[PDB]
Structure formats: structure tokens, C-alpha cells
Design a binder for these strands. Structure first.
Ligand code: MG
Ligand code: MG
Length: 117
RNA sequence: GCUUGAGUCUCGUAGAGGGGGGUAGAAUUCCAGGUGUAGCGGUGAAAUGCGUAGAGAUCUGGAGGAAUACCGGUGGCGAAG
């Protein structure tokens, strides 16, 4: 439809769920998928396998997309932070740079208290 | 009377010692806008809760508060805090 011919995939991976969204360099989202929405409701959605399933499910259908080269950037503590890439790269888009954001707060915003369980 | 206790004077050193003022980066939250769409979030597992009145994720701009990520150590300073 637009034939971007290049893009970047933002992965937000946490201990609870994984989200993957394809986007343009100018911050324009085309599609997204989540392990929770990929039929892994419960404890499996936090597993690496459900992350790669969502990655490939979001990467599929490249015809209308048109993104040939798809960079990658991950954020947060994921289920290895590598399985999603292992699936996405084989999905068809070659990877040349992966950046990791993982926002590290330089102090401030006192974290929540501890869990006594 | 004396100089060894105590003290003053000259030249230097290290240090989160204390009070006042200024400024910088990261991150959280919130507000406005753009793409986008069915979930998000949380747990041992759930639910409440948020979202089709468009959430979450993502990009641009803005407001404001608080603390200074490594350096950082069987390091330092302070009578103690
Ligand atoms: Mg918590
Ligand atoms: Mg003196």
C-alpha cells in the first residue's frame, strides 16, 4: 500500500508479556501483535516460545507491508530477548543493527516497595 | 625559674565537613497531536482495574515534582546524628 521498503520493529518484552510492533523511522505503526493475543493466555505468555510466535505472526503478510529491511530495537527484560529476533530475522527481513533501549532511570521516582511472599 | 604537657605563628595536602545560590543529563507521571487496533495490566493461578467514547505499543511537542544511575572501595569527612 505504502511500500516503505524499510522499517524498524520495536519489541517491549517484560516478565508478564511481550509486544512487537513494526514501524517506520518516522514513528508510523503498521501492525502489532502480542503473546497474550496469540492464544497463550496464562503463564505461557511469559515464555520465550510465545514471544517468537507473536513475532512471526506480526511479521507475516509482507506483501502489502513492503518492508524489505527491518531493524530491531528491544526494551525491558524479555524472555531471553533473543528468541523473538531469531524468529523475526528468519521471517524474511535481514537484520543489520539491534539497539536496546531498556530505560535505566538515573535515580528519581522511588520504586515500589518489596513483596513479602 | 625550665620545656617534654598544652597552645600560637610560616609553607603545603586530602576530604559526600557545614550554609546560600545557579545549572545539566537520564527516567516516571501528566497534557496536546500523528500512525495504529484488540486487547492491556497483574498473579503461583486470578479478579478488580483500563480500552472499540480507540486502550496498550510507537513518534513529535510541552508542563511539573523529586533523586543524582558507573565513578563507588576490607574509600573519605564529621564530637555525634
Ligand atoms: Mg508491583
Ligand atoms: Mg588556630
Amino acid at each position: 500500500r505504502k511500500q516503505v521498503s524499510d522499517g524498524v520493529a520495536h519489541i517491549h518484552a517484560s516478565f508478564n508479556n511481550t509486544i512487537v510492533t513494526i514501524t517506520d523511522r518516522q514513528g508510523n505503526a503498521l501492525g502489532w501483535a502480542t503473546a497474550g493475543g496469540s492464544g497463550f493466555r496464562g503463564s505461557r505468555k511469559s515464555t520465550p516460545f510465545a514471544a517468537q510466535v507473536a513475532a512471526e505472526r506480526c511479521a507475516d503478510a509482507v506483501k502489502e507491508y513492503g518492508i524489505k529491511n527491518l531493524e530491531v530495537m528491544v526494551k525491558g527484560p524479555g524472555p531471553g530477548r533473543e528468541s523473538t529476533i531469531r524468529a523475526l530475522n528468519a521471517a524474511g527481513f535481514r537484520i543489520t543493527n539491534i539497539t536496546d533501549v531498556t530505560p535505566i532511570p538515573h535515580n528519581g521516582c522511588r520504586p515500589p516497595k518489596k513483596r513479602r511472599v
